[PDB]
Design a protein around this ligand. Structure first.
Ligand SMILES: CC[C@H]1OC(=O)/C=C/[C@H](C)[C@@H](O[C@@H]2O[C@H](C)C[C@H](N(C)C)[C@H]2O)[C@@H](C)C[C@@H](C)C(=O)/C=C/C=C/[C@@H]1CO[C@@H]1O[C@H](C)[C@@H](O)[C@@H](OC)[C@H]1OC
Ligand SMILES: CC[C@H]1OC(=O)/C=C/[C@H](C)[C@@H](O[C@@H]2O[C@H](C)C[C@H](N(C)C)[C@H]2O)[C@@H](C)C[C@@H](C)C(=O)/C=C/C=C/[C@@H]1CO[C@@H]1O[C@H](C)[C@@H](O)[C@@H](OC)[C@H]1OC
Ligand SMILES: Nc1ncnc2c1ncn2[C@@H]1O[C@H](CSCC[C@H](N)C(=O)O)[C@@H](O)[C@H]1O
Ligand SMILES: Nc1ncnc2c1ncn2[C@@H]1O[C@H](CSCC[C@H](N)C(=O)O)[C@@H](O)[C@H]1O
Ligand SMILES: [Mg+2]
Ligand SMILES: [Mg+2]
Lengths: 252, 252
């Protein structure tokens, strides 16, 4: 990075993922030690105790790629992340728009702001077995709307181009008041959250727009992706980002 | 802030002072609670447990003012900080040069890298009384050269335009290899450290350059400043920054 924009976006990635102060990770899943590990934060594989995003540098770089490509190529629409936790990825998205002085696109921040949902008999069997709800406390996942707003304000990026969609995706997505998306970033882990958002938000993704599946390594997530793509006859190349995420670019 | 440069430098200030994650302060001096207090970090009056600078937002803004004015006005010379702790103010200084693609100026980082010196019989009576050495561990002040280098690297700002002057100022300043300074930032607290640097570095401060006295609220520091100014017939207006620091701009 040499230009002001390049320096800003580089620093913003380093800051939301907190390579700057390198906070400890929660101990959960495959992470058995609390110590900061560079490689884990680089590929977004730990559970930061303090950092504002857990998606890591490779998926932040991907988000930047997708937003910049949409801007460059004149792909119409907003940016939506479904599953935002402390807000770091959406903060970075808003910063990208800020850096290029884009005044006519919005970052939509969608989340229960309550962590993973309690499982009921309505849930897909794979979601029920996985029961993501059980690790809400373990990785400090429930994060209120007020806290996420607090966090945008800390980098000076809380403004009218950031809009919030509080609630469960099955409830908020069908009538969410955006008309077009240039980037749809899905990070809700489950079959349910993935299918909710593909069903109700993907049709508003512009041709040339990007669909990012953060959690593709999770079998329930991946099953929703393939079910949805099969149903709609979507054959757009699935491109791998790191050990967790993939994306495709919508051809039509 | 709206340009890439403005956004970058704004974020860099917020990051080195850690308004982003808002670390606790040490409980020392007039600070009686550990909790982050916005006003205290804004004015640089606490003792951050994690942040890379303790000078606060107002004195960061002042440093930016002085460096940008020197660049704008074509004042020749490098930037020197005497007393750098974890390096945050010097990191920010390097960032300013980076933002404007300045390739012909250096940030000089001068410190014992060991905290305040033990008092000897040679010390000024006010320094002996104050005995700053007593506070080293309490506010985690001793910070090694390796750690400071580590810290610049985290921002991507460790390069050949950052040079280090390890040692006591009375030892390092008289023969420090720089020829001219555009900004001289003094943050060594004591009569001794202030007089060391005024004596041996100030004569290399260019006309139009800036002399920043971070610690002017400390009587021993202020005593050195007026003794030095009186000796050299310096009458340049002393301008307040906040409740600790002042600066003047050199006319003669
Ligand atoms: C710590 C929280 C995570 O828990 C996990 O990562 C939980 C992984 C469990 C422990 C695994 O199960 C174990 O596999 C071993 C090979 C054998 C072991 N024996 C005893 C049976 C067995 O316990 C995995 C394989 C369980 C299966 C069902 C699975 O795929 C679980 C996924 C759960 C992911 C949980 C949510 O993590 C999310 O992962 C995404 C990839 C990230 O992007 C991020 O998404 C927002 C993250 O959210 C915190
Ligand atoms: C905890 C470490 C600091 O300890 C301090 O901050 C020391 C504060 C002493 C205790 C103060 O004295 C007290 O003032 C009260 C209002 C009343 C109280 N009664 C009993 C009289 C009285 O004790 C101050 C006013 C003493 C005078 C001599 C002074 O200015 C002290 C300077 C010593 C500063 C110590 C070093 O702090 C440095 O202060 C600079 C202003 C900062 O920019 C920063 O510089 C690098 C910082 O370094 C950690
Ligand atoms: N069905 C659902 N409806 C709404 N939010 C959901 C949901 N299932 C999971 N979530 C939310 O999905 C998020 C997954 S963590 C998301 C990580 C985030 N993108 C980052 O940058 O770090 C959590 O905040 C959780 O509250
Ligand atoms: N006589 C002396 N010679 C060299 N370094 C000294 C010194 N007296 C004090 N110091 C150093 O002065 C520093 C004061 S703290 C400086 C704070 C720093 N400018 C910031 O941005 O946060 C300490 O790092 C200490 O090691
Ligand atoms: Mg994920
Ligand atoms: Mg000071």
């Amino acid at each position: 990075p040499s230009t002001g924009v390049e320096l800003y976006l580089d620093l913003l990635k380093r800051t939301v993922s907190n390579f700057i102060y390198q906070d400890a990770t929660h101990v959960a899943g495959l992470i058995t030690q609390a110590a900061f590990v560079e490689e884990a934060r680089e590929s977004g594989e730990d559970y930061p105790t303090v950092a504002h995003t857990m998606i890591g540098m490779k998926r932040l770089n991907n988000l930047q790629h997708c937003v910049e490509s949409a801007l460059r190529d004149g792909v119409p629409g907003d940016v939506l992340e479904t599953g935002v936790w402390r807000g770091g990825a959406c903060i970075f998205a808003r910063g990208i728009l800020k850096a290029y002085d884009v005044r006519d696109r919005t970052v939509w921040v969608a989340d229960s702001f309550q962590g993973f949902p309690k499982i009921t008999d309505d849930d897909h069997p794979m979601d029920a077995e996985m029961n993501l709800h059980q690790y809400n406390a373990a990785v400090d996942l429930p994060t209120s709307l007020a806290t996420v707003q607090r966090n945008f304000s800390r980098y000076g990026l809380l403004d009218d181009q950031v809009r919030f969609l509080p609630g469960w995706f099955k409830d908020t997505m069908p009538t969410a008041p955006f008309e077009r998306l240039a980037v749809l970033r899905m990070d809700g882990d489950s079959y349910g959250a993935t299918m909710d958002v593909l069903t109700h938000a993907y049709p508003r993704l512009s041709p040339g727009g990007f669909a990012i599946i953060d959690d593709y390594c999770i079998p329930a997530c991946r099953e929703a992706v393939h079910e949805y793509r099969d149903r709609h006859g979507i054959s757009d190349e699935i491109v791998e980002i790191d050990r967790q995420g993939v994306y495709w670019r919508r051809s039509a």
